Scaffold this active site. Structure first.
Site, PDB file in Angstrom:
ATOM      1  N   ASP A 173       0.830  -1.204   0.000  1.00 36.97           N
ATOM      2  CA  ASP A 173       0.000   0.000   0.000  1.00 36.97           C
ATOM      3  C   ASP A 173       0.869   1.261   0.000  1.00 36.97           C
ATOM      4  O   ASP A 173       0.908   2.033   0.955  1.00 36.97           O
ATOM      5  CB  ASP A 173      -0.978  -0.004   1.182  1.00 36.97           C
ATOM      6  N   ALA A 174       1.596   1.423  -1.099  1.00 43.18           N
ATOM      7  CA  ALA A 174       2.388   2.617  -1.338  1.00 43.18           C
ATOM      8  C   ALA A 174       2.152   3.105  -2.759  1.00 43.18           C
ATOM      9  O   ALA A 174       1.805   2.325  -3.650  1.00 43.18           O
ATOM     10  CB  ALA A 174       3.868   2.361  -1.097  1.00 43.18           C
TER      11      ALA A 174
END
Lengths: 81, 1238, 238, 60, 209
Positions: free
Chosen positions: D37-38
């Site tokens: 989740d970047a």
């Protein structure tokens, strides 16, 4: 003090790492400097130079509270591997 | 010479307390009051008396502020007052001295008790006062067996008052100063017997002495506005009015009671985290403005001075520089805003010490919470890269939970280079990849590296020599890899030359190596092969990777094939070639979950509608049935809500059908399909909740209960369970749902918000308590553990002496065969049927490790099993060379003398390397091994369990019950076998062997349903009922024996004539209940398991009543296999090592739930800790009566409270003197290796 | 910090420049980029649809609704994307900036509504130069009110002591807060000088023991509340 | 403003006061920084104003 | 009461007999392995049917470690044992000058006589055992390793070979029945060979205190 029979033909990793640390302090106060004095010539990496020792002429002595002084020269036994 | 070796609290040494006396009471005012100014006064709040301001003549120390250790001084007040603590003591123990005689405690006696007290450890002398707790002053004066009874004095609990009359006792009490006693007689009678330490006399509250002013800070505002201090004992100076002078003593002590009685951080930093994979695995990087955080020793050395002065000239606002450098004369000088400096005489101006910035490790540490493993803070490199993230090789996010919400992270700074070198080469390359708690790698392709590398490996992908581009971020690449690469040959020569996708993965061309693997995550047979990858010596023969063949697997990896053979430093440098090879391939291929990735076709939606119809139909059939029952339940047993299990499993069939419909037509060129074919992200039960059927939710491993009467939701009908009125969603998140399928989603959804929110309820306590209780464990070189007094805990680590650090493939007999497969010594062939040659090599083996021995007992115990293993290898080779050869010489059937010699040498190497003590630090590893696996997993393990009864009882919180061994355990469940190997009836006879009518009036008591109910329940008799009712005729109230009753074929229990005309009450109740129908005389329900397990039919007795020996007369039995699940009961009922093994297996039932298999040696060590003295007193969270253990755990009562103050007033020692105090006390550790004695 | 409207709270991993981002064919290159690894294991399929009614509501001028238990289904949105020239599925046909030729597998697009949370990496700049143990309250730099940085509380030092290396732990001890070699003993000696203790300069009772100021504060605060003051030494040598 | 909105976004009146930029977006894996989740947010949109902040504070 | 008489005879016989092998005495096997008919041959299977006076077990058979002087055992038919009947047993011991003996607490024996057995030890070491209870022997149980005991000279030998003092080993207090079946007194070490797989024999040593 020939009570040196109950160690595997290897020093332990903890003892070896700490003797590297105390050799770090040694070569980091002024000089016990060794086989190549400053052939490896670098800025402030104090530790990473005496890691490359591979001879280490010093003695360390390992015990047990209910036992005598199992002594060991660094030379007379095998290394981290 | 000698630092602290044994130190405890400190007190007032009266001499050195009072030479530093300046003023006790100068006047009625202090703080330079009457001067109308404040130069410095008055001689006690100033000069010093304890250094609480900028500067004054520090007494015995110097100078300000620190190193002016708290200065003392006589500030005596002489206010009349006495021992409040011994006020309470005298009130409680009731005049323990036997005032006013103070005669000898014992008489002759029996000197046995004398010598027993004189030849036993301390913390025991309270028994003498316990014996004289009551008999004191009420006895024969000058008699035998004691010397008390003098003089009729017992103390009254009138609050803090101690009123001592010449009591009868209980006949001489008065109300107002008569029949009193003065504590001065107590003082004189001093002038549990030990005035060496336990003196109540000198504790008189008349020569009160003050702690120094180093406790108290005074915030002098430089404005004369507020100088509050706390508390402190000197404040009674303002009572000079009453200082001029039995109830009066009580008033004085009440006035006294107002004011008399009741490794954190260094060199740190915290920012947010967002990493790079460009940082080689060992390396890490920090922000740049952490170099603006300084004041480092880096003590100058002769070879360094010039390289140091290079950066010394920079100063405050340059990154590679220096600031605040510590000068030779202990007066450090700054190069910050007052710098205007750096002339720097080139060898002396800082000839001792310098201080630079973060240039190259120069290690830094990273903090995480909670720190599940010791591998949540590790040692790793530097230099330095900007953009104030916490960047590091993203393959090691697993042991940190470096979560990416943007929630910040903590950085250390170690500014001491003594064990820094030790730290950086012990927990920097061996800590990361191998854990002793699990034996499984922590570093792994977290994500898309998995799918990117997979896609590389896919049999489709064909590449270009023009696609040597992506090669070159890996092995033609960043620092420390730029050798050549051998350009794997042109693996097609068609009309179209092309490079397959595998040996583009299997690419490196410095320091050639060898490897092997197998068994990926797919089926068996050449079945479109995504398994048995079969890597040979660094190429890629078949296969396609997976999380179990490229990530945090167990025995097949890029580690346990490239950590063992070939060593370290070749695993931390194939992970980097992946980290830059694979995820910079996706950027040329793209993954994009659109919608069609989660749309089921409109040609197999049918398989959901028709199954919904069928399912609801059969559920309705049964739900109608339970009112008429034509099928029927009963069986089930019960059957009221056993039209729950059937409907549960019908909806389970529905979801299984639906799922399997969600995973067939998915065209293979698909996303999440290609994030569950590879363990990468998500599974096969999430490509089903997004396609067909998200049902069914639950609550507690059971469908949604009511909460309106007899119906779950009001948007439904009364009393009518169904797959709708009790949560069963049926709409895939694609065609999302309906407002009676959402509100049954945020009530199993509110599990993962309560699961992960009371997970940190039990673990937060138990982790810190296990750490606090289990530090003293050491691993001294005799292969034996020892304790605080060097008491033996073990002698070997289980014969082997091994610990889970070096758990190579199966230990070490199957993977090493592959290891020597990959390095081929060609010259040999089958001519002599080498089986005999293999026996000759077994002979050179027998010779070549009978030179074994050293620190030993680790090779002979397994040397013969080694021999047996090579013997069976030779036998298999004989069978192969006979039948298979019954011409490539059958592949030569490779085995050569050289290979087997290398094989045995490798065996010896790994067997002698995996040797702990020497070393070894085995304790805390096992402590956290048993601890945190209670923290991680509770999700997919204790809830499937979906949904059925019959023997699934507890999981992680059983750790609490095992450790505490508390008697309030609500599951004393005692398993035991039976006439086990039988049929349902054969064991059912003994099962029955394991183990109600109108009471009347007019000279008659009762009857019984002695009819075939008992004859079909369990073999008892009316005579047995008579025998039982004869036994006390009641419980706990004096009924009769009455010798006897039941003078009829059915019992007539002869209500005994109304001698106690009070009650027919007991006459009814005491016979109403069961007497011969409990089966153990104190137990809850018995149990039966007519279950077909391990092939045959097993039959057990899951009895739930303490204790063992309940299985004396279970003539089954099976007595050999009788077991238990309660530690303290099996302590006394069964053997000592029996209880040790039960503690081993009990914590090895809390961890069989899914995944987690902690090392058996860890629970073995915990069980050895359990049973020092044999008699099993397991390590409880509050204390143990086991003197060879650590006394520190006793003090940890969770937590320290007023009890230590009360013991202090009684002169009792404290048991906080273990080794967890060492970190607050700041002394070197001394065990195993810290006890140097040349 | 970002959020997504779907509890999908990513962070800026890279910050790429314009010319390297993929461009579809029209000329559109992303602002944000997700990777399809937050979805299949979180199963927010309320996001693969929001990007349908964005790109179908702007390409047509509409302004769409997906409302709880109502909304706008996938079929009409798909037909809208058809009418203004795209897939049913709204999956564009992108070429890659870095090298300059088509991505092999198509690339989802369309408007999202990224929220931008608080709690950034500038309000979270914190670091500590040194920590001594003071005399005022006799504390190290714990938590706040002295600096930002660390706080090795319960579980933190619980991990610290649980390492398995002897003088790694010794170093942690020696560098914890302070290790002043102040002189103190039991035989006519207290917290004072070393060479000539004005408390008691017996000249035979010099100790110079490493000790944090916390134990000294314990000494002081327990002087008022009497308790056994054991004090002694032992040889480091043979 | 939001652009896939809900009939209950209007009723709050707080769609006259939207809380987030409305962003063009791909679904794309760039190179090992995206991973857990970047987000590879391109510049030249931070430059053109995507997602400023105006963090105030207060001294009294 | 054959339905319990038979199993009483079997299991009590086996317990006491292999407590004689606990002291390493040969009690020939035919007394150990039998059938129900052989226990009828033993006692008719009913010398006490409903508790008449049976042929009292009263092993009274010398051990082999002490093959000469005194090693004998009683068994009281009384379901509860009292002070006076314990005097009877101890005077029966006096009749042959015994060293150790054995009283069985069938259901419950008086605390005063419990203290008597505590104090009448010096010539006759007597015990408050519920010997009809504990009816399955733990050392016989196949879940507990053999609790082999060692003599003090071997204790000193072993604690020199592993370099320990005799007050620092693991222990086994006499209260636990593993130290009651062997009847072990202070200053002794028990060998408890933990059963396993790699070697099947991991030897461990446990003191008394």
């Amino acid at each position: 003090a020939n009570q040196k029979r109950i160690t595997t033909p290897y020093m332990t990793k903890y003892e070896r790492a700490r003797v590297l640390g105390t050799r770090a302090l040694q070569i980091a106060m002024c000089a016990p400097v060794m086989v190549e004095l400053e052939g490896e010539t670098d800025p402030l990496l104090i530790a990473m130079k005496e890691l490359k020792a591979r001879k280490i002429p010093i003695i360390i002595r390992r015990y047990l509270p209910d036992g005598s002084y199992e002594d060991w020269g660094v030379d007379e036994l095998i290394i981290t591997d | 010479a000698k630092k602290i070796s044994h130190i405890c609290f400190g007190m007032k040494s009266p001499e050195e307390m009072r030479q530093q006396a300046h003023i006790q009471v100068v006047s009625k005012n202090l703080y330079s009051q009457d001067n109308q100014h404040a130069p410095l006064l008055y001689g006690v709040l100033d000069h010093r008396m304890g250094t609480s301001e900028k500067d004054r003549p520090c007494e015995t120390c110097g100078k300000n502020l620190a190193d002016c250790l708290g200065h003392y001084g006589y500030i005596d007040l002489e206010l009349p007052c006495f021992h409040v603590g011994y006020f309470r003591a005298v009130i409680g123990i009731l005049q323990m001295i036997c005032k006013t005689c103070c005669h000898i405690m014992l008489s002759q006696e029996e000197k046995k008790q004398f010598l027993d007290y004189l030849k036993r450890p301390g913390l025991t002398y309270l028994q003498k006062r316990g014996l004289k707790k009551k008999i004191s002053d009420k006895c024969r004066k000058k008699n035998i067996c004691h010397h008390c009874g003098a003089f009729n004095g017992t103390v009254k609990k009138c609050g803090l008052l101690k009123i001592i009359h010449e009591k009868y006792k209980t006949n001489k009490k008065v109300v107002r100063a008569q029949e009193n006693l003065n504590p001065l007689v107590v003082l004189n009678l001093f002038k549990l017997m030990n005035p060496e330490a336990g003196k109540p006399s000198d504790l008189i509250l008349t020569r009160l002495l003050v702690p120094p002013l180093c406790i108290r800070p005074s915030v002098v505002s430089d404005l004369k506005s507020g100088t509050n201090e706390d508390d402190l004992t000197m404040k009674l100076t303002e009572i000079i009015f009453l200082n001029d002078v039995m109830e009066d003593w009580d008033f004085l002590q009440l006035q006294c009671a107002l004011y008399i009685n009741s490794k954190r951080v260094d060199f740190s930093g915290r920012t947010v985290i967002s990493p790079d994979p460009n940082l080689r695995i060992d390396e890490v990087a920090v922000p740049v403005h952490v170099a603006k955080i300084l004041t480092f020793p880096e003590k100058v050395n002769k070879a360094n001075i010039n390289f140091l002065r290079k950066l010394v000239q920079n100063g405050p606002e340059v990154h590679p520089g220096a600031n605040f450098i510590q000068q030779r004369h202990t007066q450090m000088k700054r190069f910050l805003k007052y710098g205007n400096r750096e002339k720097m005489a080139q060898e002396l101006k800082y000839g001792d010490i310098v201080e630079r910035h973060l240039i190259d490790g120069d290690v830094v540490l990273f903090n995480r919470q909670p720190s599940l493993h010791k591998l949540s803070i590790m040692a790793h490199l530097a230099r330095v890269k900007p953009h104030r993230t916490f960047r590091f090789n993203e393959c090691v996010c697993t042991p940190y939970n470096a979560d990416f919400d943007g929630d910040e992270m903590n950085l250390h700074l170690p500014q001491t280079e003594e064990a820094k070198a030790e730290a950086l080469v012990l927990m920097g390359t061996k800590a990361n990849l191998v854990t002793p708690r699990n034996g499984e790698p922590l570093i792994a392709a977290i994500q898309d590296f998995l799918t990117g590398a997979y896609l590389l490996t896919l049999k489709d992908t064909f590449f270009d020599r023009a696609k040597a581009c992506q090669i070159i971020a890996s092995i033609l690449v960043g620092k420390d890899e730029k050798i050549k690469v051998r350009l794997p040959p042109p693996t097609i020569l068609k009309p179209v030359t092309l490079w397959t996708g595998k040996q583009i993965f299997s690419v490196i061309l410095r320091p050639s190596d060898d490897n092997p693997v197998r068994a990926n995550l797919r089926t068996k047979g050449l079945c479109a092969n995504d398994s048995y990858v079969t890597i040979q010596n660094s190429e890629l023969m078949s296969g396609s990777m997976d999380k179990g063949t490229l990530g945090s697997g167990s025995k097949n990896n890029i580690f346990y094939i490239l950590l063992r053979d070939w060593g370290q430093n070749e695993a931390a440098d194939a992970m980097s070639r992946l980290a830059r090879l694979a995820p910079v391939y996706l950027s040329n291929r793209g993954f994009s979950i659109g919608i069609g990735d989660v749309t089921p076709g409109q040609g197999l939606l049918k398989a959901k509608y028709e199954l919904l119809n069928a399912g609801y139909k059969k559920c309705d059939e049964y739900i109608e049935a339970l009112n008429t029952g034509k099928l029927q339940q009963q069986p089930g047993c019960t059957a009221e809500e056993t039209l729950e299990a059937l409907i549960l499993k019908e909806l389970s069939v529905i979801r299984d059908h639906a799922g399997s419909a969600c995973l067939r037509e998915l065209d293979k060129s698909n996303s999440p399909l290609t994030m569950a074919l590879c363990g990468s992200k998500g599974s096969f039960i999430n490509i089903s909740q997004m396609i067909a059927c998200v049902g069914q939710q639950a609550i507690s491993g059971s469908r949604v209960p009511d909460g309106f009467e007899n119906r779950s939701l009001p948007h439904f009908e009364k009393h009518s369970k169904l797959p709708a009125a009790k949560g069963f969603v049926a709409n895939s998140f694609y065609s999302g749902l309906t407002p009676t399928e959402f509100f049954f989603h945020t009530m199993a959804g509110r599990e993962g918000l309560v699961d992960t929110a009371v997970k940190t309820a039990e673990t937060g306590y138990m982790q810190r308590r296990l750490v606090k209780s289990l530090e003293d464990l050491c691993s001294q070189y005799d292969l034996t553990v020892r304790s605080s007094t060097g008491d033996i805990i073990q002698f070997i680590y289980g014969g082997d002496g091994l610990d889970p650090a070096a758990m190579e493939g199966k230990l070490e007999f199957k993977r090493v065969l592959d290891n020597i497969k990959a390095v081929f010594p060609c010259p040999s062939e089958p001519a002599l049927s080498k089986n005999e040659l293999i026996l000759t090599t077994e002979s050179i083996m027998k010779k070549s490790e009978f030179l074994c021995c050293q620190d030993s007992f680790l090779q002979e115990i397994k040397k013969f099993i080694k021999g047996v293993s090579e013997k069976i290898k030779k036998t298999r080779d004989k069978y192969g060379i006979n039948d298979n050869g019954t011409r490539v010489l059958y592949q030569l059937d490779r085995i050569t003398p050289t290979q087997v010699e290398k094989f045995l040498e490798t065996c010896r190497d790994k067997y002698m390397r995996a040797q702990m003590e020497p070393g070894s630090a085995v304790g805390a590893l096992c402590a956290q091994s048993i601890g945190e696996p209670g923290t991680q997993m509770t999700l997919k393990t204790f809830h499937f369990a979906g949904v059925a009864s019959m023997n699934i009882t507890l999981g992680v919180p059983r750790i609490k019950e095992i450790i505490n061994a508390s008697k309030a355990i609500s599951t004393p469940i005692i398993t035991a076998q039976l006439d086990k190997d039988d049929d349902a009836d054969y064991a059912r006879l003994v099962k029955g062997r394991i183990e109600v009518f109108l009471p009347d009036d007019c000279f008659i008591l009762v009857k019984l349903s002695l009819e075939r109910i008992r004859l079909l329940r369990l073999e008892v008799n009316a005579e047995t009922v008579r025998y039982s009712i004869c036994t006390s005729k009641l419980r706990v109230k004096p009924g009769d024996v009455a010798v006897h009753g039941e003078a009829v074929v059915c019992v007539t229990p002869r209500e005994n004539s109304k001698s106690s005309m009070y009650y027919v009450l007991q006459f009814l109740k005491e016979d109403l209940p069961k007497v011969v129908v409990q089966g153990i005389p104190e137990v809850s329900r018995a149990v039966i398991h007519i279950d077909e397990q391990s092939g045959k039919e097993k039959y057990k007795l899951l009895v739930e009543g303490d204790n063992l020996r309940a299985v004396m007369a279970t003539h089954g039995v099976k007595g050999t296999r009788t077991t238990s699940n309660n530690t303290y009961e099996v302590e006394k009922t069964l053997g000592i090592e029996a209880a040790r093994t039960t503690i081993i297996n009990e914590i090895q039932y809390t961890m069989v739930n899914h995944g987690m298999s902690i090392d058996r040696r860890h629970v073995m060590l915990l069980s050895d800790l359990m049973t020092y003295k044999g008699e099993v007193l397991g390590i409880t969270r509050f204390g143990l009566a086991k003197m060879k253990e650590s006394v520190l755990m006793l003090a940890s009562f969770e937590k320290t409270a007023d009890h230590l103050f009360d013991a202090a007033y009684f002169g009792q020692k404290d048991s906080v003197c273990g080794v967890s105090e060492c970190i607050i006390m700041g002394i070197p550790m001394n065990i195993g290796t810290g006890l140097f004695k040349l | 910090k970002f959020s997504s409207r779907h509890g999908q709270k990513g962070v800026c991993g890279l910050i790429v420049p314009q010319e390297d981002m993929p461009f579809c064919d029209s000329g559109i290159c992303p602002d944000i980029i997700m990777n399809p690894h937050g979805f299949p294991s979180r199963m927010t399929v309320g996001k693969l649809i929001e990007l349908l009614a964005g790109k179908a509501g702007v390409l047509d001028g509409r302004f769409h609704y997906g409302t709880a238990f109502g909304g706008s289904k996938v079929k009409d949105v798909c037909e809208d994307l058809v009418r203004h020239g795209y897939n049913y599925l709204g999956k564009d046909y992108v070429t890659s900036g870095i090298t300059g030729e088509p991505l092999e597998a198509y690339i989802y697009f369309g408007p999202v509504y990224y929220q931008k949370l608080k709690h950034m990496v500038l309000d979270k700049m914190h670091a500590r130069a040194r920590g001594p143990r003071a005399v005022l309250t006799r504390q190290p730099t714990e938590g706040r009110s002295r600096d930002g940085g660390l706080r090795l509380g319960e579980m933190e030092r619980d991990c610290l002591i649980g390492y398995g290396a002897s003088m790694l732990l010794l170093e942690r001890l020696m560098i914890s807060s302070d290790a002043f070699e102040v002189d103190v003993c039991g035989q006519c000696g207290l917290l004072g000088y070393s060479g000539w203790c004005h408390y008691c300069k017996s000249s035979c009772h010099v100790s110079s023991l490493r000790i944090p100021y916390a134990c000294k504060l314990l000494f002081q605060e327990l002087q008022s509340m009497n308790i056994i003051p054991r004090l002694k030494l032992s040889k480091y040598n043979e | 403003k939001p652009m896939v909105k809900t009939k209950t976004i209007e009723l709050i009146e707080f769609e006259k006061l939207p809380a987030g930029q409305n962003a063009t977006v791909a679904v794309m894996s760039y190179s090992g920084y995206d991973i857990e989740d970047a987000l590879v947010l391109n510049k030249a949109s931070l430059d053109r104003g995507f997602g400023r902040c105006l963090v105030y504070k207060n001294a009294k | 009461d054959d339905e319990e008489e038979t199993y009483r005879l079997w299991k009590i016989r086996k317990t006491i007999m292999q407590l004689c092998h606990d002291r390493g005495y040969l009690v020939t096997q035919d007394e150990l392995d039998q059938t129900l008919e052989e226990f009828k041959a033993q006692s008719g299977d009913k010398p006490s049917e409903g508790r008449p006076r049976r042929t009292d077990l009263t092993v009274l058979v010398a051990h082999n470690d002490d093959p000469t002087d005194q090693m004998f055992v009683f068994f009281p038919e009384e379901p509860k044992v009292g002070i006076k009947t314990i005097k009877v047993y101890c005077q029966r011991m006096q009749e042959e000058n015994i060293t150790r003996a054995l009283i069985v607490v069938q259901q419950g024996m008086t605390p005063s006589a419990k203290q008597s057995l505590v104090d009448m030890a010096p010539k006759y070491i007597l015990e408050q055992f519920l010997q009809q209870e504990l009816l399955i022997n733990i050392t016989e149980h196949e879940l507990v390793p053999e609790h082999v005991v060692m003599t003090k000279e071997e204790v000193t030998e072993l604690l020199a070979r592993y370099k320990l003092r005799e007050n620092q080993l693991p222990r086994i207090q006499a209260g636990d029945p593993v130290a009651r079946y062997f009847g072990i007194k202070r200053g002794q070490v028990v060998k408890i060979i933990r059963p396993s797989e790699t070697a099947g024999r991991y030897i461990t040593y446990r003191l008394v205190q």
